[PDB]
Amino acid sequence: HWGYGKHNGPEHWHKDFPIAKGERQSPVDIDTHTAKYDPSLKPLSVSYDQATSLRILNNGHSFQVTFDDSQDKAVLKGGPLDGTYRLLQFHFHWGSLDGQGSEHTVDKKKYAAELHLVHWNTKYGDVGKAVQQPDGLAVLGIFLKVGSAKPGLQKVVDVLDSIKTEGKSADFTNFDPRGLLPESLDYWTYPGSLTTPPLAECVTWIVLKEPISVSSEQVLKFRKLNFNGEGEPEELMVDNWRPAQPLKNRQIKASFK
Numbered sequence: 001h002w003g004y005g006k007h008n009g010p011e012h013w014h015k016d017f018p019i020a021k022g023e024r025q026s027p028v029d030i031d032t033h034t035a036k037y038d039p040s041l042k043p044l045s046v047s048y049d050q051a052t053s054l055r056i057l058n059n060g061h062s063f064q065v066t067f068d069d070s071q072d073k074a075v076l077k078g079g080p081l082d083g084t085y086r087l088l089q090f091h092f093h094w095g096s097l098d099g100q101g102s103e104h105t106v107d108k109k110k111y112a113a114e115l116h117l118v119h120w121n122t123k124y125g126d127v128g129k130a131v132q133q134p135d136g137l138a139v140l141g142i143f144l145k146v147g148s149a150k151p152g153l154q155k156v157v158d159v160l161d162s163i164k165t166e167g168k169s170a171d172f173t174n175f176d177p178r179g180l181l182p183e184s185l186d187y188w189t190y191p192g193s194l195t196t197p198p199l200a201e202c203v204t205w206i207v208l209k210e211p212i213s214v215s216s217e218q219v220l221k222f223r224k225l226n227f228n229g230e231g232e233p234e235e236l237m238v239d240n241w242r243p244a245q246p247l248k249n250r251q252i253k254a255s256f257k
């Protein structure tokens with residue numbers, strides 16, 4: 001089964017998921033001098049006031065926080081998007097050292113980690129149907145750099161000890177994801193894919209220009225998680241990022257000059 005190691009990592013995924021070599025794969029390097037400002041792009045609308053978080057879970061490739069998506073409660077609209085996209089979950093990708101960990105890069109620069117808030121287009125009724133559509137999902141990507149602590153991340157960090165190994169979950173209600181956002185909603189956008197299997201080409205990517213800062217103590221707690229299940233040889237969950245893929249016939253648009 002797939003992972004991030006030498007024998008099951010990103011260079012192997014195409015054998016089970018041939019779309020790994022497809023025409024709109026993610027992540028990509030964002031070349032800031034080639035991205036074009038698009039004045040027709042509307043402001044992003046992030047409406048998280050009624051978000052209802054449910055659980056936090058170690059799924060063997062990251063940890064994720066899941067939300068109630070049975071109603072319009074936490075939604076993303078505007079920007080490049082048509083219609084309403086409901087927040088399903090967020091998760092992170094991170095590195096073994098501070099100089100790597102992000103999936104998207106900016107002028108080849110790698111950040112220490114990357115937060116992905118995963119949303120799906122309500123016109124398709126459920127997320128499984130949405131993943132089969134070219135406009136089915138919208139992922140809001142936020143870079144993390146190491147510096148001052150991010151207070152809105154601390155409640156997450158606090159609970160990671162309880163989900164150390166694959167399969168573990170914990171109650172994670174009343175979490176406000178607005179605490180994970182930077183000040184600015186300036187963004188780049190391009191059509192892409194899921195960055196883990198099945199690698200489906202169903203995502204409108206919205207990558208925020210402004211990173212959030214997290215403390216060294218916060219990211220160190222990410223690095224104490226395990227890929228393995230309890231009772232198996234301990235393999236630290238680090239470097240769970242897919243590298244940049246070919247841009248091919250795609251243009252990255254910027255919301256800002």
Ligand SMILES: NS(=O)(=O)c1nnc(NC(=O)[C@]23C[C@H]4C[C@H](C[C@H](C4)C2)C3)s1
Nearest residue numbers: 116118127128131139193194195196197
């Ligand atoms: N790293 S990223 O944000 O591009 C993501 N890469 N893969 C992701 N997968 C999902 O989000 C799913 C949401 C539900 C349906 C598909 C089957 C399970 C269930 C998970 C997809 S997000």
Ligand SMILES: [Zn+2]
Nearest residue numbers: 091093116195
């Ligand atoms: Zn992701």
